Each structure stands twice: as C-alpha cells, then as structure tokens.
Amino acid sequence: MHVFYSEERRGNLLILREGEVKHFRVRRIEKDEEFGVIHEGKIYVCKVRREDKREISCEIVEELETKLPPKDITLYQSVTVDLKTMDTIVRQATELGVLTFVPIISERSFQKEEAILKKTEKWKRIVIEAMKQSRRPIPMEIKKPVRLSDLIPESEENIILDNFYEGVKPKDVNLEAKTYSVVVGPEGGFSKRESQILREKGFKSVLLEPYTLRTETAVVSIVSILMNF
Amino acid sequence: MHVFYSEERRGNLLILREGEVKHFRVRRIEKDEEFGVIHEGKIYVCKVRREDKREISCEIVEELETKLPPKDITLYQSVTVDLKTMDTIVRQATELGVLTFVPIISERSFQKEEAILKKTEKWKRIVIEAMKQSRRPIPMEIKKPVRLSDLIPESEENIILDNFYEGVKPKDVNLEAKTYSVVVGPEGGFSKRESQILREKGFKSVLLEPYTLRTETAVVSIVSILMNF
Ligand SMILES: C[S@@+](CC[C@H](N)C(=O)[O-])C[C@H]1O[C@@H](n2cnc3c(N)ncnc32)[C@H](O)[C@@H]1O
Ligand SMILES: C[S@@+](CC[C@H](N)C(=O)[O-])C[C@H]1O[C@@H](n2cnc3c(N)ncnc32)[C@H](O)[C@@H]1O
C-alpha cells in the first residue's frame, strides 16, 4: 500500500497538497484502491475522493494503530560542513525511529546559524518523505540549533560518539535505558577540549569498532544498536 | 595525518602512482610532513623521498598499529535499481569492515549483469578511498554478480534481512560466530517466493526495529550490530 502525508483535514477527508499531489499522480491510484495517509500521528487507510490540480481529497476508511519506537532517542548532530550530508542524516535518523533531532554548532561544524535555520525547512520535508517510506506516523521533531558548549545531559543514558577518544564499546552502554541523548561530531570531529567537557558533564564516550567512520555512518551505527537492543 | 594507497614497493620506498599522485597533491602536504601509506595489509608512516611528474616515492620511517575487523562478513547485496545507491553501500561496507562484497540479482533488483560489471570498476575505486579515510589496511573484495537462487549458507551464521517476514531480532542471532553471510534486498525488497526459498536453504531471517529502512540504512544497521557484538 502506498503512503502519503497530510497536514489538512476537512471532515472525514484528509487533504494532500503541493508535493504530495504530484506524488499521488505518479502512483496512478485506482478509484477504489486503498492507500495510507499520515495525519496527526496516525496512518489512515483511505480511498480517493477528489483529484484536482492543487488538491487530492482522501476519504478515511480505517484509522490504524500507531507503532512507536522502543526507545526515545534525541540526536544532537554537529552540523556537517558539507550541508548536503545533513539530508542523509536527517532521513536516516527518521527511518531509524529517532524522536528528536537537534542541530549542534561545535568548533569544527558548520557555523552559520541563519543558514541552518533556512535549511531546516528542507530537513523537515525530508523527514516527511522518510515517514512515508518507512511507514512511520510519528514525526521526528527538528529543533532550533544549540551550541555544543551549552549541552547538559538529561536522559537516562547520555552518549558522545568520539573516534578520537579511547572510549567504551557499545555493549558497555546501558542498553536497558528507555531514553537516550547521543552527540555526534562533524567531519572534523570533536576537539580534545570540547569532548573533555562533554565527558566531564556526564556524556559516556563510545567508540565503535573497528575503524573511524564518516559521520552519517556512525549515526546509523549507534542508533541501530540502541534501537535494537 | 593523511593516508594514501600504494601497490608498489621498491626497497624501503612505497610508490604512489596514477590518480593517487593527484590525490597526494590535492592534500597539499608540507615539507617533512609525515603521512600514512597503505601497502599489502599494513599502514606505514612515511615522508616524501622524491616527487616526480607522475609518481611520488615515499620513504618508510615507521609503521602504524593496524587492526583487522573482529568479524568476517560477506555482504550479498541485491543491486539497487538506482545504481548510484550502490556507491554509498560499497563505501559504507568498506568503512564498517566488511571483507567480501557480492552483488546479487534478485526478483526486484537491478537486472543488467553487463551494467553491474561496468560499475564494479568504480566500486573498487570507492573501496580504496574509503580504506584511506578509515585507515583500513585490508581491501574489501568485490566479486562478480550472482543470482539469489545460487546462494549457499557458507558461513558460521547466515542471515537474510527481510522487512516483509516476521524474523528474529538481531540480538538473537549467533553473535559468537566468527564468519557471517548477510543478504540484503533492493528498494522493492524480497518477494515472498524468493525469501521462502532462501530461508529453506539455511538463511536465518532477521527483522530490524521499529520501522522499514532504505537498503543502505539496513546494511549499516546490521553490519554495525554484528561488528560490535
Ligand atoms: C569522520 S569522524 C572524525 C574524522 C575522522 N577521524 C577522519 O578524519 O576520518 C566524524 C564523527 O563520526 C563519529 N565517529 C566516527 N567514527 C567513529 C567511531 N569509530 N567511534 C565513535 N564515533 C565515531 C564521531 O562523532 C566523529 O566525531
Ligand atoms: C526498503 S526495504 C523493502 C521496501 C520497504 N518495505 C518499502 O516499501 O519502503 C529494502 C531492504 O532493506 C532491508 N530492510 C529494510 N528494513 C528492514 C527491517 N526493518 N528489517 C530487516 N530488513 C530490513 C531488507 O533487506 C529489505 O529488503
């Protein structure tokens, strides 16, 4: 079943707009063909009603039960100097079930906050596309940027991924925790001074084996481990 | 320090040739600056001996401590219909430590064998670049394409990643195995017909939580779990 996204409800009809109208057209949906539509935290099985140029209305047939991630993870991602890489990180974090995404400004990360705020518009659209593809009805919230220097661990388990520090193995982490905070560096990584402060604050430094990975690969590695164990 | 790749040694000198010389010059190495050079399974610390027009000789001054992957993994990757995606999978599999990469032709995968063979040339270049960036001294072999119907469970643990089958959790597979065979599907996944055959042949079906991932995301997810546990 194809899945679409809506942020507009009119009675018992879910409305598709702009990009979703185009996506709907591409799928060449049949008159009585059922499809899913994500709206306000749930996936609704629907059938088509109106097919117009700037709008597709979908009749709600059945409201499905929403499956939530087994763990509540907040990813504090140092913005990559190559902004394009964030498209992948945001997409994959969404697929994996991460609940909250916080862009971080660190010593070696992208530095322009204004550009980060603008790019966030695109990142939110990427989250929506990933939600449709992964059949994830709950959004991944993208928050305003925070500076690494101001972070304070507050989750049940708090981790800093660092290839430059002889940290602990993933299995040494509290895998029974239900809430996590994970801090990941940009291409250049974390400076020794930056990471030291984070470790002193209470972030457990984790080292993935056996090699140093690119930022996006490290994100999926740690999140997949935490989400599945 | 920067790391380079060589397949030619002359006495105590490691030689960089072809495109590697261009790569070296792009890195703008300073006078007396030391750098690493991968050669036959080891990474040597070197300094420039002589720079020529199309080759650079590097004097070995020491040897870096290297580490091999803790697990021997063979990834059987159904070729994605979007061939570009394979560039990412090959690169990440290399970063993660996968030893052997085998492109597979399944019911819903890319079908042109001739095109797969052509792209393999690029995949081999990607492997070398990932080796340099991850400081991985051993290559990842990219084999000729084979059909899903011709796969055999040759490793200590043989797994098929399938979102369409209620398989077991990753933490429940044989994590004490030294060798693994991992089969991953294309964008459209595995048909019920072909997966049933693979399961009967001896492949253990694994289901990642909580949502359906894109192929590349699933690869990093399972490989990271196997390598770190
Ligand atoms: C590419 S790495 C740092 C640069 C890398 N050392 C290099 O020069 O190739 C970017 C980020 O990914 C994460 N990372 C990469 N490899 C890691 C590993 N093996 N263990 C833990 N974190 C890692 C860390 O958050 C790191 O700051
Ligand atoms: C994109 S998935 C299959 C199509 C997907 N269900 C969809 O329609 O969006 C591609 C491949 O990634 C792997 N995969 C993705 N999610 C998975 C999961 N949750 N558990 C196990 N394997 C998964 C499987 O090998 C699958 O064949």
From Swiss-Prot, chains A, B:
Primary subcellular site in the record, as a coarse category: cytoplasm
Enzyme class: transferase
GO CC field: cytoplasm
Job description of the protein: Specifically methylates the N3 position of the uracil ring of uridine 1498 (m3U1498) in 16S rRNA. Acts on the fully assembled 30S ribosomal subunit.
Subcellular localization, as worded in the UniProt entry: Cytoplasm
GO biological process annotation, one example: rRNA base methylation
Listed PANTHER family: 16S RRNA (URACIL(1498)-N(3))-METHYLTRANSFERASE, RIBOSOMAL RNA SMALL SUBUNIT METHYLTRANSFERASE E
SUPFAM superfamilies on file: alpha/beta knot (SSF75217)
GO molecular function: rRNA (uridine-N3-)-methyltransferase activity
Protein name: Ribosomal RNA small subunit methyltransferase E
Record EC number: 2.1.1.193
A Pfam cross-reference name: PUA_4
